[PDB]
TrEMBL record:
One MF annotation (Gene Ontology) recorded for this entry: hydrolase activity, hydrolyzing O-glycosyl compounds
Species of the source: Acetivibrio clariflavus (strain DSM 19732 / NBRC 101661 / EBR45)
Keyword set includes Zinc: no
Keyword field: Hydrolase, Signal
Protein name: O-glycosyl hydrolase
Shown segment, full-protein numbering: 29 to 461 of 534
Any GO BP: polysaccharide catabolic process
Entry superkingdom: Bacteria
Length: 433
């Protein structure tokens, strides 16, 4: 017997969308399952009618590394030497998947994150670990600008977002490059900003995606008068951290993208893990009020952890869809790019968390309610400032996967629905007709 009040006229941040990644040969592992299962995986990830409807696609900028193998390894870089450019589309094994999802599903937000600059730019001469040489800052600035221009002029792919560095705090056993927040400001102020201005780059910069979810790596660039001009989006991951406000980022009026999170420690594919990531979306939208939220892989060959929404077995050429694909789909399928979060009772009762969104251009709306508790909860939703005739519920539980339910009549801007325990329900409706 709890009440949720959804206000139509109290709005918050604009949602840029949701996405996943297929970096490190995982885009080719989808094709290795055959054309039939490949289209099924594309449909489960990007379809807005029977899939998660992800609107952003995250890829890796080829660095030319020699680590890993064909199942999980790096791609060739378009600039293997300082004096050699190699615009061979076969170097990027993610291009065929991008062309397919952009044509069939209209996914028009392309983000390429740089895990590491080429080995000839690094202080250790390798894409694994190390840092960017200070005498190579201009080379890496041109490296980023030439990639955005030629991916359009040579390959016909419009790169809308560029990630300057993936986890600048960490040196890994794979493609990685360590940065300090001061070195990032020097790179932005003295190199990236003048180069991107000179090349007329219109792609938005996703700032160095910190492993932990904080803005500490972007504070220096945000407070610099020249660097702040192209800190369009402050990117960050949520590995081992929690969702917190970004004070300096919000003061500068920039965007916040949570570009990667997954379960590298456990292997839970049930509704319990699915509600963990739905709760992470709710926390990302209410406390930080960010704009975009990503998972790590959409489909990967790792069947032993939760690094991907779809676990593919390359031996038997089969895949298994975890519950987290549908729980995240409770947000991603309906909340399209350009939507706007509106006010809603964020915690009406114990273990129930609600957010509300709307499309300012069409009048459509969506109310996502989570119930990660053990008890059934009857919730009465009062719609303040808008009076639709009905809403359509979509529920994901231990026995349901984004399942559409019977329409619920809205009587005098109010409707009721009992949330099953360990479930998530999204109510979709339209105010214009
Ligand atoms: Cl879209
Ligand atoms: Cl390579
Ligand atoms: Cl080519
Ligand atoms: Cl290397
Ligand atoms: Cl500095
Ligand atoms: Cl500063
Ligand atoms: Cl900085
Ligand atoms: Cl500033
Ligand atoms: Cl800009
Ligand atoms: Cl911005
Ligand atoms: Cl959580
Ligand atoms: Cl859309
Ligand atoms: Cl509950
Ligand atoms: Cl009203
Ligand atoms: Cl119905």
């Amino acid at each position: 017997a709890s009440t949720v009040t959804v206000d139509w006229d109290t709005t918050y941040q604009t949602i840029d969308g949701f996405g996943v990644s297929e970096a490190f040969h995982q885009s080719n592992n989808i094709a290795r399952l055959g054309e039939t299962k490949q289209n099924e995986i594309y449909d489960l990830l990007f379809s807005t009618t029977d899939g998660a409807g992800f609107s952003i696609f995250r890829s890796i900028l080829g660095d030319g590394g020699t680590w890993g193998n064909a199942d999980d390894g790096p791609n060739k870089t378009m600039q293997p030497a300082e004096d050699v450019w190699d615009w061979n589309e076969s170097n990027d094994d993610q291009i065929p998947m991008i062309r397919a999802i952009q044509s069939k599903y209209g996914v028009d937000q392309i983000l390429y994150t740089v895990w590491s600059p080429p080995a000839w730019m690094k202080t250790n001469g390798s894409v694994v670990g190390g840092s960017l040489r200070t005498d190579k800052y201009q080379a890496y600035a041109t490296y980023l600008a030439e990639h955005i221009k030629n991916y359009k002029s040579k390959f016909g792919i419009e790169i809308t977002h560029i990630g300057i560095q993936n986890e600048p705090n960490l040196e890994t056993s794979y493609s990685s490059c360590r940065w300090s927040p001061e070195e990032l400001r020097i790179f932005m102020r003295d190199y990236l900003v003048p180069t991107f201005d000179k090349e007329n780059i219109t792609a938005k910069v996703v700032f160095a995606e910190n492993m932990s979810f904080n803005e500490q790596y972007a504070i220096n660039s945000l407070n610099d008068p020249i660097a702040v001009k192209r800190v369009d989006i402050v990117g960050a991951h949520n590995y081992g951290s929690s969702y917190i406000p970004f004070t300096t980022t919000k003061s500068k009026g920039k965007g916040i993208w949570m570009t990667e999170v997954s379960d590298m420690n456990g292997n839970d594919t049930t509704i319990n893990d699915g509600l963990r990531w739905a709760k992470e979306i709710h926390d990302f939208m209410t406390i930080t009020e960010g704009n975009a939220w990503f998972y790590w892989w959409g489909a990967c060959f790792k069947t032993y952890n939760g690094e991907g929404l779809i676990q593919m077995d390359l031996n038997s050429k089969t895949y298994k869809v975890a519950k987290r694909l549908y729980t995240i789909g409770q947000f991603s399928r309906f909340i399209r790019p350009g939507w706007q979060r509106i006010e809603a009772t964020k915690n009406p009762v114990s273990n129930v968390y609600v957010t509300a969104y709307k499309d300012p251009k069409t009048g459509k709306f969506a109310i996502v309610a989570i119930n990660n508790g053990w008890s059934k909860q009857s919730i009465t939703y009062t719609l303040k400032g808008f009076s639709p005739a009905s809403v359509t519920p979509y529920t994901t539980s231990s026995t349901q996967n984004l399942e559409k339910g019977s329409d619920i009549t809205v009587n005098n801007s109010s409707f009721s629905f009992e949330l099953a325990p360990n479930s998530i329900t999204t109510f979709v409706g339209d105010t214009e007709s």
